[PDB]
A paper describes a structure:
Rv1625c is one of 16 adenylyl cyclases encoded in the genome of Mycobacterium tuberculosis. Adenylyl cyclases convert ATP to cyclic AMP, and these enzymes are classified into six types based on their sequence similarity. It has been shown previously that the monomer is active and the dimeric fraction is inactive.
To further elucidate the role of this residue in dimer stabilization, a single mutant F363R of Rv1625c (Rv1625c-F363R) was generated. The single mutant eluted predominantly as a dimer in gel filtration which showed much lower activity (63 ± 13 pmol cAMP min−1 mg−1) compared with the wild-type enzyme (199 ± 30 nmol cAMP min−1 mg−1). The structure solved by MR has one monomer in the asymmetric unit. It cannot form crystallographic dimers as the protein crystallized in space group P212121, thus indicating that the protein crystallized as a monomer in spite of being a dimer in solution. Clear electron density was observed for the region Glu237–Lys425, with 42 and 18 residues missing at the N- and C-termini, respectively. Because of this salt-bridge interaction between the N-terminal Glu239 and the mutated Arg363 residue, the N-terminal segment is pulled towards the dimer-interface region. When the monomers of Rv1625c-F363R are individually superposed on different subunits of dimeric ACs or GCs, the extended N-terminal segment of one monomer was found to make steric clashes with the residues of helix α2 and strand β2 of the other subunit. Thus, the extended region of the N-terminus of this structure, stabilized by the mutated residue, hinders dimer formation. Similar to the triple mutant, the residues present in the β2–β3 loop of Rv1625c-F363R also make steric clashes with the subunit when superposed on the dimeric AC structure in addition to the severe steric clashes made by the extended N-terminal loop.
Numbering used by the authors: 237 to 425
The structure:
Amino acid sequence: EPERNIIADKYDEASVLFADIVGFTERASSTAPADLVRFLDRLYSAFDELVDQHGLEKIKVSGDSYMVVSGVPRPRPDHTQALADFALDMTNVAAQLKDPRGNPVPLRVGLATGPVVAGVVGSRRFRYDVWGDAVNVASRMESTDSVGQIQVPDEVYERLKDDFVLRERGHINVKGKGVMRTWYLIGRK
């Protein structure tokens, strides 16, 4: 049954992360849906542990993705930095796990900051959900990410540049809109 909206509110500013493990479908890998589910549950349980250790908020999403949010529902003035630190731990932890073949986990991570909408949605049962501008951006940062990096837009770079190390990935000129630039979040300063 499709979910429906119940209540929502706009938040001026929050930070949103998406992560996934790309190419772990039965189609792509031939691994049985049950073995996939077990290996993913391990990886996602590791991320669950990091979310709790960091005091952040996991948003139950449908689909392959893992979603984490900072400064929504409850604001914190370091929301971007806190999600960056969590993102770094998430990719550094995943880098110590391997698939069953002993190959690196093909993790993608995108991270964005900006307005969002949050509230309650549900079908039979309900859950807290977050969507809108920064979620859209985070989603695109994750789905065009190079595997093993953390991709972020300019807005995140402006907010983090003094305290983390970032390297520019590239830019594209879109006439007549403007320039689209993204960065890799590499580490802490």
